[PDB]
Amino acid sequence: ATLKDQLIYNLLKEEQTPQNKITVVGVGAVGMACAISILMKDLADELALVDVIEDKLKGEMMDLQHGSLFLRTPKIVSGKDYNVTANSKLVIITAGARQQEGESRLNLVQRNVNIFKFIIPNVVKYSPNCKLLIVSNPVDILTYVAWKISGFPKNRVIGSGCNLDSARFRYLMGERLGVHPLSCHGWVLGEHGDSSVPVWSGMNVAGVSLKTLHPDLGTDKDKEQWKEVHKQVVESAYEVIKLKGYTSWAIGLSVADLAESIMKNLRRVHPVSTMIKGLYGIKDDVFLSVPCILGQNGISDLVKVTLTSEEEARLKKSADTLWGIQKELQF
Amino acid sequence: ATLKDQLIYNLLKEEQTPQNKITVVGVGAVGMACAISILMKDLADELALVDVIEDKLKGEMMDLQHGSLFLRTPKIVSGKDYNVTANSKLVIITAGARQQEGESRLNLVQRNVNIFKFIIPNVVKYSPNCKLLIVSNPVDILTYVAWKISGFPKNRVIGSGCNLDSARFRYLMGERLGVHPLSCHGWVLGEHGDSSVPVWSGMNVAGVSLKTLHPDLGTDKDKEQWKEVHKQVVESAYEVIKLKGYTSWAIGLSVADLAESIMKNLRRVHPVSTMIKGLYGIKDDVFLSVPCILGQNGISDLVKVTLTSEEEARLKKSADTLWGIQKELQF
Amino acid sequence: ATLKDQLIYNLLKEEQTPQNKITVVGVGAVGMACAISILMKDLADELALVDVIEDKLKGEMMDLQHGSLFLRTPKIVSGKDYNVTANSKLVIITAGARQQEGESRLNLVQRNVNIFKFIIPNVVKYSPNCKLLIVSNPVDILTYVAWKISGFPKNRVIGSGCNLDSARFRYLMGERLGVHPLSCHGWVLGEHGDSSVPVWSGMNVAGVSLKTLHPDLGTDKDKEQWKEVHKQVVESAYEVIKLKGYTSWAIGLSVADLAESIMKNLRRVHPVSTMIKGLYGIKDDVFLSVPCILGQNGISDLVKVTLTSEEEARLKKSADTLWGIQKELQF
Amino acid sequence: ATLKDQLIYNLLKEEQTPQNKITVVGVGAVGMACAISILMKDLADELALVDVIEDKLKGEMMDLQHGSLFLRTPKIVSGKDYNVTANSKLVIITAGARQQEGESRLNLVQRNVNIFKFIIPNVVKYSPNCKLLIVSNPVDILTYVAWKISGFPKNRVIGSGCNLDSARFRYLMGERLGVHPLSCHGWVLGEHGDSSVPVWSGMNVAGVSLKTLHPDLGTDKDKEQWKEVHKQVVESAYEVIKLKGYTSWAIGLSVADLAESIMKNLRRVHPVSTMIKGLYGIKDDVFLSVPCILGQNGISDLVKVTLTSEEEARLKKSADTLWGIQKELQF
Ligand SMILES: NC(=O)C1=CN([C@@H]2O[C@H](COP(=O)(O)OP(=O)(O)OC[C@H]3O[C@@H](n4cnc5c(N)ncnc54)[C@H](O)[C@@H]3O)[C@@H](O)[C@H]2O)C=CC1
Ligand SMILES: NC(=O)C1=CN([C@@H]2O[C@H](COP(=O)(O)OP(=O)(O)OC[C@H]3O[C@@H](n4cnc5c(N)ncnc54)[C@H](O)[C@@H]3O)[C@@H](O)[C@H]2O)C=CC1
Ligand SMILES: NC(=O)C1=CN([C@@H]2O[C@H](COP(=O)(O)OP(=O)(O)OC[C@H]3O[C@@H](n4cnc5c(N)ncnc54)[C@H](O)[C@@H]3O)[C@@H](O)[C@H]2O)C=CC1
Ligand SMILES: NC(=O)C1=CN([C@@H]2O[C@H](COP(=O)(O)OP(=O)(O)OC[C@H]3O[C@@H](n4cnc5c(N)ncnc54)[C@H](O)[C@@H]3O)[C@@H](O)[C@H]2O)C=CC1
């Protein structure tokens, strides 16, 4: 008989059932960055890719497969049909439309909603116990959308949120202080993007409040202008885009970090977008970034950060804005 | 005084001298894939990126920097001037020109050679003891070019060669056999691309010659058509391009593998392009892929693979072709 | 002291206040053609350029500056912030979005309206007494939009309209007759583009009605097929695009003509888009091209052209169509 | 009979013979900028355009024709056949190849030479008494090439040379001093581009030597670093390109200035490239920029500028380099 059968004796006619499977939807810049990061942190035994452009999809899948010798993720598959995603522990959404200059924030959101109206029901059909990690912008809204469409409990629907923002913050802090960002601690909360809130009260190195050493920290009479740090966290993503076209690497790594906490059940604390109704004064179904304990069941627990009146108010306003957009949305 | 001076007491006014530094020249798809691969295998304490397009360059540098919290590479720099590459242990060249409407292999090659005539001397100026790892196509020729321009000894000029090709081969073999490519062993040597030679004699799983189990292996009377594997190895790179535009991921992972072997002085054996004159019947200054022992000094040693006459002849002809191209090239 | 202070004695610490300032918004082909035309007719003492693409903007500004020796416009500035436009007598809008694969007239329009929702308020903030000259397509609609957003009186909001169309008409007539277009007189009114109306009644050379010499002029039984002239006026803009990519030169010269009439208070008569409600049977807030008297305050007066019923009706229908579009548009 | 014949009585069956005709070869960015500048300075009664891309050509020609009402140049024609250029007083060459990254300076020059080998003989056939104004880069070489191919006397072959460079210089001087460049005087000579020489000895405002007021002017111990001015004159064209893609406006205006001096026989002095053999120490057939008297017969006379040893030497070196390139060139 065949060379394979001459060389190999078979014990098991094998039920191929994935044990730690991850699916990425959208193989654009972000989606693929997430993919290579995940492959190189060995977070999955099966990686599935899904997109509507079949060329790009198959191409990216083959390019990865070819690097298999250098990886420890034994099944990489792709497809337009969602059966390829069956039994994922984790499904990351990076599919999205590109905002165009004229396009209202609203029109964009609605386009993306229609996209989600296609994706989420399919994902849920084939992996009804997965965690959803939403990356597509504008992310607090789309995480709400995904939650509405899936009918999943709030713990299994997570948005990438201010994870990345907080990483940029810590990087900038580190640059200012001559210390690695792993040792510079600081939190960015609320609405991802322009409206995010830097919590100065808890900025520290080695458990030393920077705010008590420098009481004017992050105010206007701040001679060292630390507000600039946060301003930069916001404008960075702009500059980077202007410069290179888009953001991929940093967000891919942030998402991989999150995935590591979930897949490995670590119970680390991350600033991610979660359904915050009831807390921080918020009284609508909106998603904002707070410090969340991530693990095998998604968001198990939430850190109640003490805020100033102004911080609480910034959040309230973000929530009112977000809600205003969300109620003009059809499911 | 400043918040920094109030928070941090300084012992050392520090000589910043990189200890394990890597430079990637060319931040296109390939270059950047190499970069993220290097960043995620913790192979470097400083990574420098160099390109002529300053926008793209700075953007990519920033996108990486923003992911610093999730990395263990504490300095990432970019620049148009080569002083940013000073003291690299390893410099990867991915820079190249894109072939255009009505451009002969020869014209494209000459343009790339002129590119190298600029890059290599600068590189050598600022890192005179580095190893050069050449990735740009056509790679055997361009590695020969780098070697000529740098005046480095043949051990410090390595070309990517058939590393990736051999990886694709092992992936395909693995697919045919239901085994991981790590355990399917097989070698592709000589000229990277179309003219490469699959050494069937040494195809094995667990030290079991496939060629002795299936003597017709890889011939034309081979009922299982194993030639197809090799054909595919060649056409893969085509299909992928056709599908997605280009190749990045696999080649990046291959290069990172090589880099690991060098930075860590492993003395693993890899099929790379080395100045092969004196061996295999070859009598011209050409580079071909053979099994090379890689370590802190680049190529320390070479494996002398037993070949058939036909194999030896394919090699001879590729070497004659390469020389034929090279002798029509001005330095 | 400095060479400057040694060479030059200063009388005045000078309030830099522009006296005849022009702003062009949008530095694409059209915008820049307008700019060189304005620079070479000596219509301005300060020219400001504004765009969202900062690279293109600064480059064009510098390329112009470098030609200063050959010009009599002593200050050329560019910028992304609208403070560089402060105190313009005249602001030309050429900014616009490009229509894409599967984009309705309506979607494109809405994108452009959103663009205007940003530009116009800024413009008005820094130059509250300027005249607005709108060039971006679809121009009658977009002039209506600028008028709505700015709250300027109808005399200060002028659209390019059928100025250029009428120029093409006169060129074609001139070709047919062997006379310069300066001496061939003829009017194209109403909706710029396909729906425009050629007023044959007033086609003349030296005050000689072509319509009375050739009563069948411009009808279907016209053996000389003068309709073709008008048809061509419409198809010209198509052919040119097909051939070269776009239109710049002619439109630029047209806009500069208009500008001359305004900056110099000439009170020449030009066919431009003006808020025509109350006249010609029109009963909606729409803009159409009629003969307008242009001068230092924009459109001071309007020529009441005698029309046939059919002409009046074409106008009525274009106005109803325009309104139909506008009522589906959000401010 | 016809409407034309009913309206117009003909005296003259007219020999159409152009009296002040200009031809532009190459309707790229530069060529068209030259064209619009010429049209707006009313330097021609007939303007002819020539290119190998027939679409682009016809398109640009129509776009100009359509602006005829606003111009005082009554015949604008285009074509691929050179009969359209017959009887030009002046033929401007802007045709050229784009230098590619890999491309040696030499390869580019040779490509352009082959282009000229097509253009010049045709131009000369149809306008044997014209002046040739060479703009294409590298311009001192191509002006030599045009002269060799045409067999015209040295007065009728002019290169754009350092006209533009000197305009940039005067603009920068003007910026530093708060004076219009028309009143800041200063000369840039020799090889256009990087190797150009700023003649500090004759830098002045109102006949006041800046070099005698500030003896260190343009040296290294110059505390005001005036060398930077010249450095910038060189890097400007680079920055502008980087920023916008290319240079058009400034060069178009420079060329139009030159054209004005020729067409109108003014005998102004301009820094243009002329066959400098015999002077400034140069002993080969090379072209460099010196101050030339331009008029109806092209370069009638030359200004003998007194130079330092170093300046003379810079020129000598430029000439030796240029010659070295030119003697490796086949006609
Ligand atoms: N929250 C965050 O921190 C960040 C979020 N993002 C977002 O990621 C998203 C995509 O970013 P990029 O990768 O740069 O875009 P990428 O544009 O280049 O492509 C997105 C992909 O989505 C796909 N897609 C569209 N409709 C689909 C459908 N119905 N089903 C499956 N796939 C579909 C496209 O085919 C495409 O491949 C955007 O929404 C962007 O804003 C980007 C950076 C950071
Ligand atoms: N050995 C292998 O198996 C493979 C080899 N390659 C080759 O590697 C090369 C890179 O491919 P891609 O990343 O897709 O191309 P990439 O084309 O998209 O761009 C190459 C980069 O090189 C840069 N560059 C050019 N000249 C430079 C200079 N003088 N100094 C600094 N930077 C310079 C460009 O700016 C560009 O960013 C190609 O030549 C390609 O054929 C590609 C895939 C696999
Ligand atoms: N009335 C007429 O006879 C004619 C009208 N037009 C119209 O004029 C417009 C310009 O055409 P082109 O110059 O070829 O287009 P151009 O497309 O090449 O680019 C338009 C410019 O507008 C800019 N822009 C867009 N949004 C902006 C903003 N929010 N702020 C500042 N700048 C912004 C872009 O950056 C771009 O540089 C088009 O809409 C076109 O249809 C064009 C030809 C003749
Ligand atoms: N000396 C100076 O001060 C300056 C010189 N230049 C030069 O002007 C030249 C063109 O510049 P651009 O307008 O930006 O290029 P443009 O590239 O966009 O196009 C040049 C034109 O030459 C044409 N052409 C090529 N072969 C031809 C032939 N055999 N017959 C007729 N036409 C032919 C092309 O079709 C094209 O339209 C280049 O050589 C450039 O270096 C540019 C700026 C300043």
Side-chain angles (χ1 to χ4, degrees):
Chain A
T2 71
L3 174 49
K4 177 192 187 168
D5 285 340
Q6 216 173 324
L7 174 69
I8 296 167
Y9 174 87
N10 177 251
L11 285 67
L12 286 187
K13 304 84 203 172
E14 251 165 296
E15 187 191 4
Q16 192 68 52
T17 319
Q19 288 301 305
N20 294 272
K21 177 174 177 174
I22 300 182
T23 293
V24 182
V25 179
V27 298
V30 174
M32 294 303 302
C34 293
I36 197 63
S37 292
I38 284 173
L39 284 165
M40 300 216 64
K41 297 190 73 172
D42 287 338
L43 302 188
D45 70 338
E46 187 171 312
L47 180 64
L49 304 173
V50 177
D51 202 288
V52 285
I53 309 161
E54 306 169 50
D55 277 29
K56 191 43 162 62
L57 184 57
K58 195 186 168 190
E60 294 289 8
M61 180 205 67
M62 292 180 50
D63 202 13
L64 290 179
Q65 292 172 346
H66 288 170
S68 275
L69 178 59
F70 317 112
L71 301 174
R72 305 248 164 166
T73 302
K75 210 187 191 175
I76 300 174
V77 308
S78 84
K80 205 192 53 190
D81 190 337
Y82 279 80
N83 51 18
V84 307
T85 85
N87 300 305
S88 307
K89 293 226 266 164
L90 183 70
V91 179
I92 301 169
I93 312 294
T94 56
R98 297 188 182 178
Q99 190 166 18
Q100 293 154 343
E101 229 169 348
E103 208 173 29
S104 53
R105 187 183 185 187
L106 189 55
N107 203 64
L108 182 71
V109 169
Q110 190 73 62
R111 280 208 295 163
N112 273 345
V113 161
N114 304 330
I115 290 193
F116 274 32
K117 265 168 149 176
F118 181 70
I119 297 168
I120 306 301
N122 278 278
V123 157
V124 162
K125 182 185 184 182
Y126 291 89
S127 296
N129 303 296
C130 69
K131 272 63 63 189
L132 287 178
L133 178 52
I134 298 314
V135 181
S136 340
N137 269 318
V139 67
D140 321 88
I141 287 178
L142 286 180
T143 306
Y144 168 85
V145 164
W147 173 70
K148 270 294 174 177
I149 294 176
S150 71
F152 279 13
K154 52 179 180 168
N155 53 289
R156 292 205 273 130
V157 192
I158 307 111
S160 84
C162 289
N163 204 48
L164 172 67
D165 301 74
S166 288
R168 288 184 172 119
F169 192 80
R170 294 173 77 190
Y171 166 79
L172 293 174
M173 210 192 319
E175 285 286 300
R176 284 217 188 194
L177 298 176
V179 171
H180 200 272
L182 274 175
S183 292
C184 307
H185 301 288
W187 292 80
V188 178
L189 307 188
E191 196 177 352
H192 165 70
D194 291 347
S195 310
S196 67
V197 187
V199 194
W200 310 105
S201 66
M203 268 185 62
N204 72 96
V205 168
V208 172
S209 168
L210 271 43
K211 182 70 178 191
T212 63
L213 277 188
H214 181 23
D216 288 345
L217 178 78
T219 82
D220 284 332
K221 63 183 68 182
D222 182 11
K223 286 189 73 165
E224 290 179 34
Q225 295 178 62
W226 281 80
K227 283 184 72 180
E228 287 301 322
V229 187
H230 180 255
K231 180 181 176 188
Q232 248 185 315
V233 167
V234 184
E235 281 172 332
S236 305
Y238 292 168
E239 195 180 356
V240 168
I241 287 169
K242 179 182 101 188
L243 286 183
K244 105 169 212 197
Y246 55 95
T247 291
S248 61
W249 307 120
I251 182 59
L253 296 166
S254 156
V255 176
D257 195 53
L258 293 184
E260 194 186 12
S261 288
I262 302 184
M263 300 305 288
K264 287 181 175 156
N265 194 33
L266 299 171
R267 302 176 62 81
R268 287 193 303 179
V269 173
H270 301 258
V272 288
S273 293
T274 180
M275 210 286 313
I276 209 42
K277 181 195 181 170
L279 300 173
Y280 299 92
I282 315 306
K283 300 172 177 177
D284 288 298
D285 285 1
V286 313
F287 280 56
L288 289 167
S289 305
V290 298
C292 292
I293 301 179
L294 287 180
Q296 72 186 343
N297 292 326
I299 304 167
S300 71
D301 299 87
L302 293 175
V303 169
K304 289 131 69 160
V305 180
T306 300
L307 299 174
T308 79
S309 294
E310 314 79 84
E311 298 176 326
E312 207 172 328
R314 296 261 297 279
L315 279 196
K316 279 274 238 229
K317 178 166 187 175
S318 271
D320 291 339
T321 302
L322 284 174
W323 182 248
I325 312 170
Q326 288 161 144
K327 68 196 239 174
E328 307 206 347
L329 245 61
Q330 304 162 353
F331 307 110
Chain B
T2 64
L3 175 50
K4 178 191 187 168
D5 285 341
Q6 216 172 323
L7 174 69
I8 297 167
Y9 175 87
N10 176 251
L11 284 67
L12 286 188
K13 304 84 203 172
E14 251 164 296
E15 187 192 4
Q16 192 68 52
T17 325
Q19 287 300 306
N20 294 271
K21 177 174 176 174
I22 295 181
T23 293
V24 181
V25 184
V27 298
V30 174
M32 295 304 303
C34 295
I36 194 62
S37 293
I38 283 174
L39 284 167
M40 300 215 64
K41 296 190 73 172
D42 287 338
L43 302 187
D45 70 338
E46 187 171 312
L47 179 64
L49 305 173
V50 177
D51 202 287
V52 284
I53 312 161
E54 308 168 50
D55 277 29
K56 191 44 162 62
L57 185 57
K58 195 185 168 190
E60 296 289 8
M61 179 205 67
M62 292 182 50
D63 202 13
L64 290 178
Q65 292 173 346
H66 288 169
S68 274
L69 178 60
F70 317 113
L71 302 173
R72 304 249 164 166
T73 299
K75 209 188 191 175
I76 299 175
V77 303
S78 84
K80 205 193 53 189
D81 191 338
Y82 279 79
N83 51 18
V84 307
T85 81
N87 300 305
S88 306
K89 293 226 266 164
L90 182 70
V91 185
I92 300 169
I93 312 293
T94 60
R98 297 189 184 177
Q99 190 166 18
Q100 290 156 343
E101 69 292 347
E103 207 171 28
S104 52
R105 184 185 183 187
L106 192 55
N107 203 246
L108 183 71
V109 166
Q110 189 71 61
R111 279 207 294 161
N112 273 346
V113 169
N114 303 330
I115 288 193
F116 273 31
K117 265 168 149 176
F118 181 72
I119 292 168
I120 307 301
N122 278 279
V123 158
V124 168
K125 182 185 184 181
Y126 291 90
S127 296
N129 303 296
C130 70
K131 271 62 62 190
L132 286 178
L133 177 52
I134 301 313
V135 188
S136 340
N137 270 318
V139 68
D140 321 89
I141 289 178
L142 287 179
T143 310
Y144 169 84
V145 166
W147 173 69
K148 271 295 173 177
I149 299 175
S150 71
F152 278 0
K154 52 179 180 168
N155 53 289
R156 293 205 274 130
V157 192
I158 308 111
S160 149
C162 290
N163 205 49
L164 171 67
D165 302 74
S166 287
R168 288 184 173 119
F169 192 81
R170 294 173 77 191
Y171 167 79
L172 293 173
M173 210 193 318
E175 284 286 301
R176 284 216 187 194
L177 298 177
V179 173
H180 200 272
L182 273 175
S183 292
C184 307
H185 301 287
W187 293 80
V188 179
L189 308 188
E191 197 178 352
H192 166 70
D194 291 347
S195 310
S196 66
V197 181
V199 196
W200 310 105
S201 65
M203 268 185 63
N204 72 97
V205 171
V208 177
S209 168
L210 270 42
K211 182 70 178 191
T212 65
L213 277 189
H214 179 22
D216 288 345
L217 178 78
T219 85
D220 283 332
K221 64 182 68 182
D222 182 11
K223 285 189 73 164
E224 289 179 34
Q225 295 178 61
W226 280 79
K227 283 184 72 179
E228 288 301 317
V229 181
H230 178 256
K231 180 182 176 188
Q232 248 185 315
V233 165
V234 184
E235 282 172 333
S236 305
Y238 293 166
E239 195 180 356
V240 165
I241 293 169
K242 179 182 100 188
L243 286 183
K244 105 169 212 197
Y246 56 96
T247 295
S248 60
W249 308 120
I251 180 59
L253 296 166
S254 156
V255 174
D257 195 48
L258 294 184
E260 193 186 12
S261 289
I262 304 184
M263 301 305 287
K264 287 180 176 156
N265 194 31
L266 300 171
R267 303 177 63 81
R268 287 193 304 180
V269 178
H270 301 256
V272 292
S273 293
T274 185
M275 211 287 312
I276 203 42
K277 182 194 181 170
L279 300 173
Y280 299 89
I282 312 306
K283 300 171 178 177
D284 286 298
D285 285 1
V286 313
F287 280 55
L288 289 166
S289 306
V290 297
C292 292
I293 300 177
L294 289 180
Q296 71 184 342
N297 292 325
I299 302 167
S300 71
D301 300 87
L302 293 174
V303 168
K304 288 131 68 161
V305 175
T306 300
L307 299 172
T308 76
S309 294
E310 315 79 82
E311 298 176 325
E312 207 171 324
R314 296 260 297 279
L315 279 196
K316 280 274 238 229
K317 178 166 187 175
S318 49
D320 290 339
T321 298
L322 284 175
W323 184 248
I325 304 170
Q326 288 160 223
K327 67 197 239 174
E328 307 208 347
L329 245 61
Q330 303 163 353
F331 307 108
Chain C
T2 64
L3 175 50
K4 178 191 187 168
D5 285 341
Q6 216 172 323
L7 174 69
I8 297 167
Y9 175 87
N10 176 251
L11 284 67
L12 286 188
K13 304 84 203 172
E14 251 164 296
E15 187 192 4
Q16 192 68 52
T17 325
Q19 287 300 306
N20 294 271
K21 177 174 176 174
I22 295 181
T23 293
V24 181
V25 184
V27 298
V30 174
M32 295 304 303
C34 295
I36 194 62
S37 293
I38 283 174
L39 284 167
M40 300 215 64
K41 296 190 73 172
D42 287 338
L43 302 187
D45 70 338
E46 187 171 312
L47 179 64
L49 305 173
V50 177
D51 202 287
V52 284
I53 312 161
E54 308 168 50
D55 277 29
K56 191 44 162 62
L57 185 57
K58 195 185 168 190
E60 296 289 8
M61 179 205 67
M62 292 182 50
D63 202 13
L64 290 178
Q65 292 173 346
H66 288 169
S68 274
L69 178 60
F70 317 113
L71 302 173
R72 304 249 164 166
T73 299
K75 209 188 191 175
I76 299 175
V77 303
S78 84
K80 205 193 53 189
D81 191 338
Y82 279 79
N83 51 18
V84 307
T85 81
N87 300 305
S88 306
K89 293 226 266 164
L90 182 70
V91 185
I92 300 169
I93 312 293
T94 60
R98 297 189 184 177
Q99 190 166 18
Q100 290 156 343
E101 69 292 347
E103 207 171 28
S104 52
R105 184 185 183 187
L106 192 55
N107 203 246
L108 183 71
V109 166
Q110 189 71 61
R111 279 207 294 161
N112 273 346
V113 169
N114 303 330
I115 288 193
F116 273 31
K117 265 168 149 176
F118 181 72
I119 292 168
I120 307 301
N122 278 279
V123 158
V124 168
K125 182 185 184 181
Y126 291 90
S127 296
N129 303 296
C130 70
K131 271 62 62 190
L132 286 178
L133 177 52
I134 301 313
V135 188
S136 340
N137 270 318
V139 68
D140 321 89
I141 289 178
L142 287 179
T143 310
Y144 169 84
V145 166
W147 173 69
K148 271 295 173 177
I149 299 175
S150 71
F152 278 0
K154 52 179 180 168
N155 53 289
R156 293 205 274 130
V157 192
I158 308 111
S160 149
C162 290
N163 205 49
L164 171 67
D165 302 74
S166 287
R168 288 184 173 119
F169 192 81
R170 294 173 77 191
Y171 167 79
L172 293 173
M173 210 193 318
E175 284 286 301
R176 284 216 187 194
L177 298 177
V179 173
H180 200 272
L182 273 175
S183 292
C184 307
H185 301 287
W187 293 80
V188 179
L189 308 188
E191 197 178 352
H192 166 70
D194 291 347
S195 310
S196 66
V197 181
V199 196
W200 310 105
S201 65
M203 268 185 63
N204 72 97
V205 171
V208 177
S209 168
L210 270 42
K211 182 70 178 191
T212 65
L213 277 189
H214 179 22
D216 288 345
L217 178 78
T219 85
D220 283 332
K221 64 182 68 182
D222 182 11
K223 285 189 73 164
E224 289 179 34
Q225 295 178 61
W226 280 79
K227 283 184 72 179
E228 288 301 317
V229 181
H230 178 256
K231 180 182 176 188
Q232 248 185 315
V233 165
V234 184
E235 282 172 333
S236 305
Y238 293 166
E239 195 180 356
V240 165
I241 293 169
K242 179 182 100 188
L243 286 183
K244 105 169 212 197
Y246 56 96
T247 295
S248 60
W249 308 120
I251 180 59
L253 296 166
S254 156
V255 174
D257 195 48
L258 294 184
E260 193 186 12
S261 289
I262 304 184
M263 301 305 287
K264 287 180 176 156
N265 194 31
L266 300 171
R267 303 177 63 81
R268 287 193 304 180
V269 178
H270 301 256
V272 292
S273 293
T274 185
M275 211 287 312
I276 203 42
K277 182 194 181 170
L279 300 173
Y280 299 89
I282 312 306
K283 300 171 178 177
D284 286 298
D285 285 1
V286 313
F287 280 55
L288 289 166
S289 306
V290 297
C292 292
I293 300 177
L294 289 180
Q296 71 184 342
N297 292 325
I299 302 167
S300 71
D301 300 87
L302 293 174
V303 168
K304 288 131 68 161
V305 175
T306 300
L307 299 172
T308 76
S309 294
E310 315 79 82
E311 298 176 325
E312 207 171 324
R314 296 260 297 279
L315 279 196
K316 280 274 238 229
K317 178 166 187 175
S318 49
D320 290 339
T321 298
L322 284 175
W323 184 248
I325 304 170
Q326 288 160 223
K327 67 197 239 174
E328 307 208 347
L329 245 61
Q330 303 163 353
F331 307 108
Chain D
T2 71
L3 174 49
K4 177 192 187 168
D5 285 340
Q6 216 173 324
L7 174 69
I8 296 167
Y9 174 87
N10 177 251
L11 285 67
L12 286 187
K13 304 84 203 172
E14 251 165 296
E15 187 191 4
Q16 192 68 52
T17 319
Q19 288 301 305
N20 294 272
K21 177 174 177 174
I22 300 182
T23 293
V24 182
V25 179
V27 298
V30 174
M32 294 303 302
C34 293
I36 197 63
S37 292
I38 284 173
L39 284 165
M40 300 216 64
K41 297 190 73 172
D42 287 338
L43 302 188
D45 70 338
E46 187 171 312
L47 180 64
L49 304 173
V50 177
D51 202 288
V52 285
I53 309 161
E54 306 169 50
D55 277 29
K56 191 43 161 62
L57 184 57
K58 195 186 168 190
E60 294 289 8
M61 180 205 67
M62 292 180 50
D63 202 13
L64 290 179
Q65 292 172 346
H66 288 170
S68 275
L69 178 59
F70 317 112
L71 301 174
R72 305 248 164 166
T73 302
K75 210 187 191 175
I76 300 174
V77 308
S78 84
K80 205 192 53 190
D81 190 337
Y82 279 80
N83 51 18
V84 307
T85 85
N87 300 305
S88 307
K89 293 226 266 164
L90 183 70
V91 179
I92 301 169
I93 312 294
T94 56
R98 297 188 182 178
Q99 190 166 18
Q100 293 154 343
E101 229 169 348
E103 208 173 29
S104 53
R105 187 183 185 187
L106 189 55
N107 203 64
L108 182 71
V109 169
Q110 190 73 62
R111 280 208 295 163
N112 273 345
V113 161
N114 304 330
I115 290 193
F116 274 32
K117 265 168 149 176
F118 181 70
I119 297 168
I120 306 301
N122 278 278
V123 157
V124 162
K125 182 185 184 182
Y126 291 89
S127 296
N129 303 296
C130 69
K131 272 63 63 189
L132 287 178
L133 178 52
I134 298 314
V135 181
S136 340
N137 269 318
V139 67
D140 321 88
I141 287 178
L142 286 180
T143 306
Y144 168 85
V145 164
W147 173 70
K148 270 294 174 177
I149 294 176
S150 71
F152 279 13
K154 52 179 180 168
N155 53 289
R156 292 205 273 130
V157 192
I158 307 111
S160 84
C162 289
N163 204 48
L164 172 67
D165 301 74
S166 288
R168 288 184 172 119
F169 192 80
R170 294 173 77 190
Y171 166 79
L172 293 174
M173 210 192 319
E175 285 286 300
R176 284 217 188 194
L177 298 176
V179 171
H180 200 272
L182 274 175
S183 292
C184 307
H185 301 288
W187 292 80
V188 178
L189 307 188
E191 196 177 352
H192 165 70
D194 291 347
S195 310
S196 67
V197 187
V199 194
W200 310 105
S201 66
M203 268 185 62
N204 72 96
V205 168
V208 172
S209 168
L210 271 43
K211 182 70 178 191
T212 63
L213 277 188
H214 181 23
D216 288 345
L217 178 78
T219 82
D220 284 332
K221 63 183 68 182
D222 182 11
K223 286 189 73 165
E224 290 179 34
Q225 295 178 62
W226 281 80
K227 283 184 72 180
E228 287 301 322
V229 187
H230 180 255
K231 180 181 176 188
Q232 248 185 315
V233 167
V234 184
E235 281 172 332
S236 305
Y238 292 168
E239 195 180 356
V240 168
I241 287 169
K242 179 182 101 188
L243 286 183
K244 105 169 212 197
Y246 55 95
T247 291
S248 61
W249 307 120
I251 182 59
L253 296 166
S254 156
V255 176
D257 195 53
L258 293 184
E260 194 186 12
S261 288
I262 302 184
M263 300 305 288
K264 287 181 175 156
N265 194 33
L266 299 171
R267 302 176 62 81
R268 287 193 303 179
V269 173
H270 301 258
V272 288
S273 293
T274 180
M275 210 286 313
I276 209 42
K277 181 195 181 170
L279 300 173
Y280 299 92
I282 315 306
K283 300 172 177 177
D284 288 298
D285 285 1
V286 313
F287 280 56
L288 289 167
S289 305
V290 298
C292 292
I293 301 179
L294 287 180
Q296 72 186 343
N297 292 326
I299 304 167
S300 71
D301 299 87
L302 293 175
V303 169
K304 289 131 69 160
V305 180
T306 300
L307 299 174
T308 79
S309 294
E310 314 79 84
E311 298 176 326
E312 207 172 328
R314 296 261 297 279
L315 279 196
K316 279 274 238 229
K317 178 166 187 175
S318 271
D320 291 339
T321 302
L322 284 174
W323 182 248
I325 312 170
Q326 288 161 144
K327 68 196 239 174
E328 307 206 347
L329 245 61
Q330 304 162 353
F331 307 110

